[PDB]
Design an enzyme around this catalytic site. Sequence first.
Site, PDB file in Angstrom:
ATOM      1  N   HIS A   1       4.155  -5.109   3.394  1.00  0.00           N
ATOM      2  CA  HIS A   1       3.870  -5.663   4.702  1.00  0.00           C
ATOM      3  C   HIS A   1       4.246  -7.102   4.937  1.00  0.00           C
ATOM      4  O   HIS A   1       4.291  -7.932   4.026  1.00  0.00           O
ATOM      5  CB  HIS A   1       2.397  -5.479   5.037  1.00  0.00           C
TER       6      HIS A   1
ATOM      7  N   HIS B   1      -2.657   4.380   5.701  1.00  0.00           N
ATOM      8  CA  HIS B   1      -2.819   4.294   4.239  1.00  0.00           C
ATOM      9  C   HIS B   1      -3.290   5.613   3.702  1.00  0.00           C
ATOM     10  O   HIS B   1      -4.058   6.312   4.366  1.00  0.00           O
ATOM     11  CB  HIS B   1      -3.819   3.217   3.820  1.00  0.00           C
TER      12      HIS B   1
ATOM     13  N   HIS C   1      -9.119   2.596   0.241  1.00  0.00           N
ATOM     14  CA  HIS C   1      -8.295   3.785   0.434  1.00  0.00           C
ATOM     15  C   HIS C   1      -7.603   3.979  -0.926  1.00  0.00           C
ATOM     16  O   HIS C   1      -7.476   3.019  -1.686  1.00  0.00           O
ATOM     17  CB  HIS C   1      -7.217   3.540   1.475  1.00  0.00           C
TER      18      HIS C   1
ATOM     19  N   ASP D   1      -4.618   1.633  -1.399  1.00  0.00           N
ATOM     20  CA  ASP D   1      -4.780   0.178  -1.304  1.00  0.00           C
ATOM     21  C   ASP D   1      -4.467  -0.562  -2.603  1.00  0.00           C
ATOM     22  O   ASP D   1      -5.317  -0.670  -3.493  1.00  0.00           O
ATOM     23  CB  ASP D   1      -6.189  -0.180  -0.837  1.00  0.00           C
TER      24      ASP D   1
ATOM     25  N   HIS E   1       0.801  -1.223   0.000  1.00  0.00           N
ATOM     26  CA  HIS E   1       0.000   0.000   0.000  1.00  0.00           C
ATOM     27  C   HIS E   1       0.823   1.257   0.000  1.00  0.00           C
ATOM     28  O   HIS E   1       1.961   1.274   0.474  1.00  0.00           O
ATOM     29  CB  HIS E   1      -0.865   0.105   1.266  1.00  0.00           C
TER      30      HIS E   1
ATOM     31  N   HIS F   1       1.221   4.665   1.766  1.00  0.00           N
ATOM     32  CA  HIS F   1       0.928   5.353   3.009  1.00  0.00           C
ATOM     33  C   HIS F   1       1.051   6.854   2.774  1.00  0.00           C
ATOM     34  O   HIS F   1       1.805   7.305   1.908  1.00  0.00           O
ATOM     35  CB  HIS F   1       1.823   4.854   4.132  1.00  0.00           C
TER      36      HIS F   1
ATOM     37  N   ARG G   1       5.544  -3.478   8.675  1.00  0.00           N
ATOM     38  CA  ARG G   1       6.010  -2.819   7.468  1.00  0.00           C
ATOM     39  C   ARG G   1       7.464  -3.306   7.358  1.00  0.00           C
ATOM     40  O   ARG G   1       8.313  -2.912   8.152  1.00  0.00           O
ATOM     41  CB  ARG G   1       5.952  -1.300   7.671  1.00  0.00           C
TER      42      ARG G   1
ATOM     43  N   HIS H   1     -10.915   0.526   4.403  1.00  0.00           N
ATOM     44  CA  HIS H   1      -9.954  -0.317   3.729  1.00  0.00           C
ATOM     45  C   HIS H   1     -10.548  -1.379   2.813  1.00  0.00           C
ATOM     46  O   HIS H   1     -11.511  -2.065   3.170  1.00  0.00           O
ATOM     47  CB  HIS H   1      -9.041  -0.975   4.750  1.00  0.00           C
TER      48      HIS H   1
HETATM   49 CU   LIG Z   1       0.016  -0.697   4.486  1.00  0.00          CU
HETATM   50 ZN   LIG Z   2      -5.940   0.661   3.221  1.00  0.00          ZN
END
Ligand SMILES: [Cu+2]
Ligand SMILES: [Zn+2]
Lengths: 153, 153
Positions: free
Chosen positions: B120, B63, B80, B83, B46, B48, B143, B71
């Site tokens: 992640h 995010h 998001h 995403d 994702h 951020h 992360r 999400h």
């Molecule tokens: Cu993330």
């Molecule tokens: Zn998200």
Amino acid sequence: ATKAVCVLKGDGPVQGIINFEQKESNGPVKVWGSIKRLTEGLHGFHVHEFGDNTAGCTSAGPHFNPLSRKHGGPKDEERHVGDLGNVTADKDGVADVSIEDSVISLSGDHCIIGRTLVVHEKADDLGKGGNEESTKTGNAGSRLACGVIGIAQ
Amino acid sequence: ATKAVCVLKGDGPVQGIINFEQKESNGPVKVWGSIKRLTEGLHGFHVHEFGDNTAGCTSAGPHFNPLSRKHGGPKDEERHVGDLGNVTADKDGVADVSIEDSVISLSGDHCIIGRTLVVHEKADDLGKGGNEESTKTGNAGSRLACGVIGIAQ
Ligand SMILES: [Cu+2]
Ligand SMILES: [Zn+2]
Ligand SMILES: [Cu+2]
Ligand SMILES: [Zn+2]
């Protein structure tokens, strides 16, 4: 108000954190922070065009120069948008950065977000050096540390 | 076509390079790259909000969600902006990324330049996990690596 942050790292020991703040307007940008493990003396400080660090600081390209001018000092009439001058490191190798610039911006066109901030090996002659390279890089030498300028809160 | 690049590194052996290309201001963004030293399996991928890596990937924020949506996965209406779903690492721990997304952008308000791309530790449940965290982070965990997205040539 927009904030931006940059974490400087390189092939050697040089490292630092530079913050940028552009008060709720398209006015001047305040740049401040510190860089450590720098040799004592003046070091060129500029915003390079690409935020590409795939080959370290080398991939950052040339100075950010949207208006195709010649290299100069921060207060000169003619300079590249990314020309921020010199930062000074003391006998301990610490450089205290406090700059206020009205040419760079954190928004639209002269926008430096996603570009590379780099600190150099030698002093930037601010274009006054009297040779070819002076008007391009200011003879600042190699790139000691660099980082991609990111959005901060 | 506009281009961007991101070098992913973390407090670990996970590292990768992701390229972004967008032909038109409005139009999908193609993300292509590869990350290695990953555990075989699904891994959250994702964008951020902040391009702040002063505290590693920790300072990237949540995010990127300019629309205050919950999400989801890349194909969901409700997701998001940041995403991008899951990235699949093989037996050798190599995750090849070949995504085309229509919500992220390299221009405008959904602009991801200057923000942080993060990979992640765990799979992202795409917000269908049925609990707060799922509608928040997709339960993707730690992360492992991240990078600020910069402008490229
Ligand atoms: Cu993330
Ligand atoms: Zn998200
Ligand atoms: Cu420079
Ligand atoms: Zn210059």
